[PDB]
Design a protein around this ligand. Structure first.
Ligand SMILES: CC1(C)S[C@H]([C@H](NC(=O)[C@H](N)c2ccccc2)C(=O)O)N[C@H]1C(=O)O
Lengths: 148, 99, 487, 248, 49, 50
């Protein structure tokens, strides 16, 4: 997935240096997820590992949305510099991203409240996803624009 | 040893089952008796700490050991947490007929 | 949306996909009472035939231990047939199971059931209820099972219940010892003493512990097996009188052939039988639980009572917690997007984007034939959220065009959608292709991989192919409605 | 609250050996209970179709076990202690005539009303294999008073067997005749519930009420439960009074 | 303890549970101070005292 | 130390069989212990009569 993202980053954004930003960001957004999963009682088991595959999605989307929108603004105006462009785009998307992380976690926590053996199974997946959205979203807010 | 399941259910299972009843956070109890052996698995509400469940069951049982038949007391009662699962099975085998 | 609900109804609902774990468990039960020698011979015949098949490399056996009803029964025995690595064997576990079933399909000495190891340990793949019919009146176990077999016949008539079965078996051979207490006393013999003699000769008596290799080991006394095997075993046993007279056991004791339960089960401090059942493919698990309860109350006597274990217990004791939580979660999502858009109506557009993802997922699984497993449900959580994220962005950018740049309601919905076209395409392309290997995955965990994958691919495709055209339409309608309110 | 019980239990076990044998056979119980009555539930026969000994037994076997399981109940005990017992009422004038001491009755019943161990037939190791393994079963505990009556104290040499029937009267009575309970003016069995230490009274009280409603559906005709004395009633009532005050 | 008091000898099976057997004398014989005189024990030399 | 005690007692209980009968009859005691001696008090009869 990481390499496929690089291919989309390279073809769509027509830059090779733009690929470095996902490379640094995606692992950081997964290592962070692991650290929280350690602090919480969660262990690595088959169901959490399946969740990690799902988690890749949230993390990749967050990097892609940020880089692309900065590039879009950097191509909309010749006069705009990369750093001004980053600030502009971040102002546009900062509020949605915070709202995305709250909305998404609201989607996942009720799954954790499901009672029964199937809710225990489902919660292992859901909570991991909720951790991922938050860690990924903080990275999208701070680390990703800076790298861009 | 040497007792039929009916005898072991009435003589051994019933005294033990009664003592453990009322142990905190216990949803239900199930006991099966087979000639020579009694297996009784308490089931506890989800989220109960195993170590706390085991120790409680043990307490209640050591009070009712005396009621139990002497042969059963001589061998004693084993209380264990069954929450564990099988990581792996290792079978040592005599390829030859020498053991 | 109507199609989604038709599709949800036609797709089977199954808890978790059956999976090849590499082992083909085999439960062999001989007729009740069979000696271990008979059972071992049968295990041997079963295992040399298995050796013939290429895929089954080795085989572990556990003679005298009944796997289903954990217990040591001489008639029962389980032979696990270890298969070859997934990458080394073309044949799946199911195919090999069929071959084993086919060879042993003929009537023979034993009955063999071949099954794949449980996908998730400690969990029944079925939605089956375990119900214990406790007897509060003191009736004997034989009487209990005649009462419960009647429950069984009523149960098999009812539609919701399927594969209704009971664990209790009174078939096992037993010998009943009749004690003439008139004679025993007259012979000046005390009852404990005449049983110590039986316990030593016919059975095993553990007198004391002896030291060996640094660990105390048991000292046991039993008779040569030549003497124990026959019913008249009693006649060679003798007990001293208090008058010092040898008196044979057969005088005052008689062994009578009888049949009785090998395994006696008591649940919740009451004698009980266990009724297991499966829901009807059409009917839900909860419906099956309700149905068997009704059958039990009418067929069984008032003296009986019904209790539940495992999954059934939880369903009966359910606080409807999940339902409350889900409603709260939605209300929270509503409000948190209301804050973002500063409009009460606008977050409805985001919630409408969600059923396009859900429709792609349930459509593809139906075409594939995959069921509504937990994996599918977890897939949905991701799908939903990814679809929501994309929608939140399209709607927000649209608001900006309408407000900041003063674009037209129609023009704004075109501009936003086009601005957000590229990010959605890029993320979908990367992710879908990334999880495409799951669809083709083989080896351990393959069924699970496939199940998570099929839902994901379908939903992702739907969200990028269909949702994006639709979300502007929703926004266009809501913005128009807001303007109408302003007028 | 729970670690104290573990500590008390651990220390008592060494003492349990030292205790007198009879005490240890009956058992010693360590329970986390306040000994302050949460509530008293009265189960009574209105019909009068069930005698008090029977009502007590129904509430021990069917209701008490369920109430003990409920979370927050340290111990639930019915006051009467009239559980069934086979009572052998010795008559000392017949014992003196037939020359039998009480002890000879005690020894006789212990020996002739017990279930012992009898092994299986066909089990291994046997040189000449048998088709089946058959398990010997025995019933040595008498279930009826007429069976208990026939326990043999001595053989009178005319091969006449002196039995309990001759020296005593047997019946199924109750273990203790010491205490009874009343609801209003009529007889009832009183089930006193003590709260487990560290548990909420109101939650436990509401749980006991809902278990009893479920149990009542299965009650034999003529049985009503009332719970006249409940402590939580006042607490809940004062909660309602302060809620009304808040509205006002 | 078996004529003035109740002695729990063993358990008897009823209703799927085990219930005590208690051997105590008739009430009239334990009703007075001189109750002790009615009760008789055998000695080692088999004579009731 | 409290939770450590529970885990020792639970493990000993599981191994009931391994133990010889005479130890079982007496019983095995698991109790939290500390070796620190805070103080040694010595009580003496000044008179020496006792
Ligand atoms: C009784 C069991 C819990 S054990 C069996 C299975 N056991 C294994 O997979 C063992 N690892 C094994 C035993 C023998 C040979 C190979 C493996 C499991 O736990 O799911 N399935 C269950 C069953 O057969 O009911």
């Amino acid at each position: 997935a990481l390499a496929l993202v690089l291919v989309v980053m390279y073809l769509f954004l027509k830059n090779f240096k733009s690929t470095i930003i996902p490379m640094i960001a995606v692992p950081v957004s997964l290592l962070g997820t692991f650290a929280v999963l350690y602090v919480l009682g969660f262990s690595i088991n088959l169901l959490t590992l399946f969740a990690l595959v799902l988690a890749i999605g949230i993390v990749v989307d967050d990097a892609i949305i940020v880089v692309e929108n900065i590039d879009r603004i950097l191509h909309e105006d010749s006069n705009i510099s990369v750093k001004d462009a980053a600030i502009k785009a971040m102002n546009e998307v900062s509020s949605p991203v915070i709202s995305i992380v709250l909305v998404l976690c609201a989607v996942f926590i009720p799954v954790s409240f499901i009672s029964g053996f199937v809710g225990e199974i489902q919660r292992q997946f859901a909570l991991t996803l909720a951790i991922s959205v938050a860690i990924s979203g903080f990275v999208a807010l701070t680390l990703t624009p800076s790298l861009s | 040893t040497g007792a039929d399941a009916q005898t072991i259910a009435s003589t051994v299972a019933t005294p033990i089952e009664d003592a453990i009843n009322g142990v905190d956070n216990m949803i239900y109890m199930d006991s099966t008796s087979s000639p020579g052996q009694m297996k009784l698995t308490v089931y506890f509400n989800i989220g109960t700490d195993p170590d706390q469940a085991a120790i409680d069951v043990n307490n209640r049982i050591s009070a009712a050991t005396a009621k139990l038949p002497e042969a059963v007391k001589k061998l004693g009662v084993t209380v264990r947490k069954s929450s564990s699962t099988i990581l792996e099975v290792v079978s040592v085998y005599s390829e030859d007929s020498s053991m | 949306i109507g199609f989604i609900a038709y599709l949800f109804k036609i797709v089977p609902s199954s808890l978790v996909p059956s999976e090849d774990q590499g082992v083909i468990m085999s439960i062999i039960n001989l007729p009740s009472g069979s000696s271990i020698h008979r059972t071992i011979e049968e295990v041997d015949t079963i295992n040399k035939n298995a050796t013939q098949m290429k895929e089954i490399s080795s085989s572990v056996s556990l003679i005298g231990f009944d796997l289903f009803t954990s217990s040591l029964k001489e008639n029962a025995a389980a032979v696990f047939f270890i298969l070859k690595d997934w990458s080394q064997r073309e044949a799946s576990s199911d195919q090999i199971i069929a071959q084993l079933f086919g060879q042993y399909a003929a009537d023979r000495n034993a009955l063999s059931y071949f099954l794949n190891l449980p996908p998730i340990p400690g969990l029944s793949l079925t939605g089956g209820f375990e119900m214990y019919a406790q007897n509060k009146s003191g009736k004997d176990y034989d009487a209990i099972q005649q009462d419960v077999n009647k429950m069984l016949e009523l149960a098999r008539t009812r539609k919701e219940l399927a594969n209704v079965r009971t664990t209790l078996d009174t078939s096992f051979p037993q010998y009943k010892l009749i004690i003439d207490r008139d004679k025993m006393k007259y012979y000046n013999l005390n009852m404990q003493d005449v049983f110590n003699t039986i316990s030593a000769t016919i059975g095993t008596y553990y007198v004391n512990d002896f030291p060996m290799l640094g660990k105390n080991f048991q000292v046991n006394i039993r008779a040569l097996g030549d003497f124990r095997n026959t019913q008249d075993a009693l006649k060679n046993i003798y007990i001293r009188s208090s008058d010092n007279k040898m008196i044979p056991l057969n005088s005052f004791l008689t062994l009578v052939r009888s049949a009785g339960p090998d395994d006696v089960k008591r649940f919740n401090l009451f004698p009980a039988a266990l009724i297991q059942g499966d829901p009807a493919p059409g009917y839900t698990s909860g419906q099956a639980i309700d149905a068997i309860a009704e059958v039990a109350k009418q067929s069984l006597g008032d003296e009986y009572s019904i209790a539940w274990s495992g999954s059934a217990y939880q369903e009966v004791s359910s606080k409807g917690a999940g339902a409350y939580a889900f409603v709260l979660g939605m209300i929270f999502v509503f409000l948190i997007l209301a804050a973002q858009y500063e409009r009460w109506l606008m977050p409805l557009a985001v919630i409408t984007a969600v059923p396009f993802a859900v429709f792609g997922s349930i459509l593809l699984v139906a075409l594939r034939g995959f069921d509504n497993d937990i994996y599918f449900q977890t897939g949905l959580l991701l799908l939903i959220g990814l679809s929501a994220k994309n929608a939140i962005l399209i709607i927000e950018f649209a608001m900006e065009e309408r407000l900041k740049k003063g674009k037209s309601i129609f023009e704004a919905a075109i501009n936003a959608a086009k601005l957000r076209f590229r990010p959605i395409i890029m993320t979908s392309l990367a992710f879908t292709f990334g999880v495409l290997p799951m669809i083709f995955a083989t080896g351990a965990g393959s069924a699970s991989r496939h199940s998570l994958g099929t839902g994901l691919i379908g939903g992702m495709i739907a969200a990028s192919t269909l949702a994006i055209f639709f979300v502007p339409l929703f926004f266009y309608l809501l913005e128009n409605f807001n303007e109408w309110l302003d007028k | 609250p729970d670690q104290a019980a573990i500590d008390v239990n651990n220390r008592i076990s060494a003492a349990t050996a030292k205790l007198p044998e009879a005490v240890k056979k009956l058992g010693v119980t360590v329970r986390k209970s306040s000994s302050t009555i949460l509530e008293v539930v009265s189960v009574y026969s209105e019909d009068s179709s069930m005698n008090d000994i029977d009502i007590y037994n129904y509430v021990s076997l069917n209701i008490l076990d369920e109430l003990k399981r409920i979370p927050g109940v340290g111990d639930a005990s019915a006051i009467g202690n009239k559980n069934y017992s086979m009572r052998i009422w010795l008559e000392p004038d017949l014992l003196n005539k037939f020359g039998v001491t009480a002890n000879d009755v005690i020894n006789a019943v212990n020996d002739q009303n017990a279930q012992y161990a009898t092994g299986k037939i066909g089990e291994e190791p046997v040189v000449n294999k048998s088709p089946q393994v058959i398990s010997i079963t025995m019933q040595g505990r008498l279930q009826t008073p007429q069976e208990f009556e026939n326990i043999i104290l001595r053989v009178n040499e005319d091969k006449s067997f002196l039995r309990i029937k001759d020296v005593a009267k047997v019946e199924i009575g109750a273990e203790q005749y010491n205490s009874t309970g009343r609801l209003n003016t009529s007889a009832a069995v009183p089930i006193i519930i003590n709260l487990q230490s560290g548990a909420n009274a109101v939650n436990t009280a509401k749980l006991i009420n809902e278990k009893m409603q479920e149990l009542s559906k299965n009650f034999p005709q003529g049985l009503k439960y009332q719970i006249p004395y409940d402590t939580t009633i006042f607490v809940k009532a004062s909660i309602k009074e302060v809620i009304k005050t808040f509205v006002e």
